[PDB]
Amino acid sequence: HFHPYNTLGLATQSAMVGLGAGVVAAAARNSLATGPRNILTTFSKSGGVVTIFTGASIAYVFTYCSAANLRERKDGWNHMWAGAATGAVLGARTKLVPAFIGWTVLCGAACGLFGWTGARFNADRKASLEQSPKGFVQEDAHQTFWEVVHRRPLSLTVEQLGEGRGINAVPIATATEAP
Amino acid sequence: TYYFIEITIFLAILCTIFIISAKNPMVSILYMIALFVIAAMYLYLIGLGIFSLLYIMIYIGAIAVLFLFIITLLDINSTELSVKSNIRD
Ligand SMILES: CCCCCCCCCCC(CCCCCCCCCC)(CO[C@H]1O[C@@H](CO)[C@H](O[C@@H]2O[C@@H](CO)[C@H](O)[C@@H](O)[C@@H]2O)[C@@H](O)[C@@H]1O)CO[C@H]1O[C@@H](CO)[C@H](O[C@@H]2O[C@@H](CO)[C@H](O)[C@@H](O)[C@@H]2O)[C@@H](O)[C@H]1O
Numbered sequence: 001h002f003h004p005y006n007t008l009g010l011a012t013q014s015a016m017v018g019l020g021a022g023v024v025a026a027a028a029r030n031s032l033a034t035g036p037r038n039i040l041t042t043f044s045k046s047g048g049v050v051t052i053f054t055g056a057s058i059a060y061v062f063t064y065c066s067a068a069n070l071r072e073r074k075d076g077w078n079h080m081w082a083g084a085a086t087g088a089v090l091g092a093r094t095k096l097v098p099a100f101i102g103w104t105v106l107c108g109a110a111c112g113l114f115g116w117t118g119a120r121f122n123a124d125r126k127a128s129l130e131q132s133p134k135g136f137v138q139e140d141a142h143q144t145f146w147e148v149v150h151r152r153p154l155s156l157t158v159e160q161l162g163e164g165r166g167i168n169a170v171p172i173a174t175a176t177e178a179p
Numbered sequence: 180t181y182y183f184i185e186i187t188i189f190l191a192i193l194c195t196i197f198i199i200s201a202k203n204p205m206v207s208i209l210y211m212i213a214l215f216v217i218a219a220m221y222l223y224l225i226g227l228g229i230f231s232l233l234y235i236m237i238y239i240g241a242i243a244v245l246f247l248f249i250i251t252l253l254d255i256n257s258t259e260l261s262v263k264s265n266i267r268d
Pocket residue numbers: 074075076079115116117118119124126127128132143144145146
């Protein structure tokens with residue numbers, strides 16, 4: 001199944017990596033600049049960069065692990081909620097309410113589309129079509145993903161779709177026959 | 180005479196710091212020639228006596244000569260290592 005997340009310590013680890021990334025990026029902006037700049041203008045003329053890094057890190061991993069622990073399953077919806085929280089933190093530097101809402105919903109939609117494709121930049125190996133069973137089944141078996149058959153079982157049709165609209169467990173013809 | 184390699188390692192560090200912080204552009208280039216000599220010392224030290232003289236012949240005797248020859252008859256401005264310039268780095 002799944003096992004519950006360490007929201008405490010993953011959020012501490014995320015705050016550590018965000019602090020380090022803010023240190024590195026503030027040093028990078030210091031070195032790549034003009035004007036009178038010294039060693040302690042790294043945190044005064046930084047442009048608020050450590051706040052960006054740490055706030056995004058705490059917000060995303062807190063909301064991700066909390067949503068995965070509240071829903072008790074793991075899919076791309078947790079990436080949607082965590083990206084909504086990250087967009088909230090990135091949109092609060094904009095001191096404006098409609099832009100804040102735009103940052104929230106659009107970053108959450110982009111991160112949910114990210115987390116729905118697998119939440120991986122790279123590939124999954126066995127989930128690929130190259131490294132999976134493909135083509136026809138050669139004789140009758142549970143049809144996997146990436147596989148094609150000629151006929152499907154009708155019990156699978158009734159269980160997956162339903163028993164409602166035009167769909168029935170026995171066809172209309174043989175349900176109405178003379179004997 | 181055990182710590183010879185350690186000594187060449189340390190002296191090479193010190194020579195690079197004197198390369199990147201030097202008044203005059205050719206004071207910096209003479210420190211580079213000294214670093215070539217420290218290299219050839221390390222190469223004889225490890226067991227490659229052939230290569231050390233190949234370094235002294237090719238790198239010192241041709242590349243450094245070309246480099247010094249360039250610095251002589253061309254004009255190159257230089258700021259020196261101000262602390263105002265480089266502790267932002
Ligand atoms: C604008 C339109 C946007 C459209 C985007 C759609 C993208 C949706 C992707 C769907 C899809 C790729 C299919 C894509 C094919 C072509 C796509 C066309 C281009 C799309 C660009 C990626 O499936 C991903 O779905 C994610 C959630 O949906 C998961 O997230 C993560 O969740 C948690 C992980 O454990 C993490 O804990 C959490 O961190 C993550 O978040 C991912 O793990 C998962 O890989 C499904 O592929 C996969 O499906 C499965 C289940 O059938 C297949 O199962 C196998 O086969 C059967 C017997 O063998 C069995 O039944 C089945 O049991 C067996 O395992 C696989 O073979 C595989 O192929």
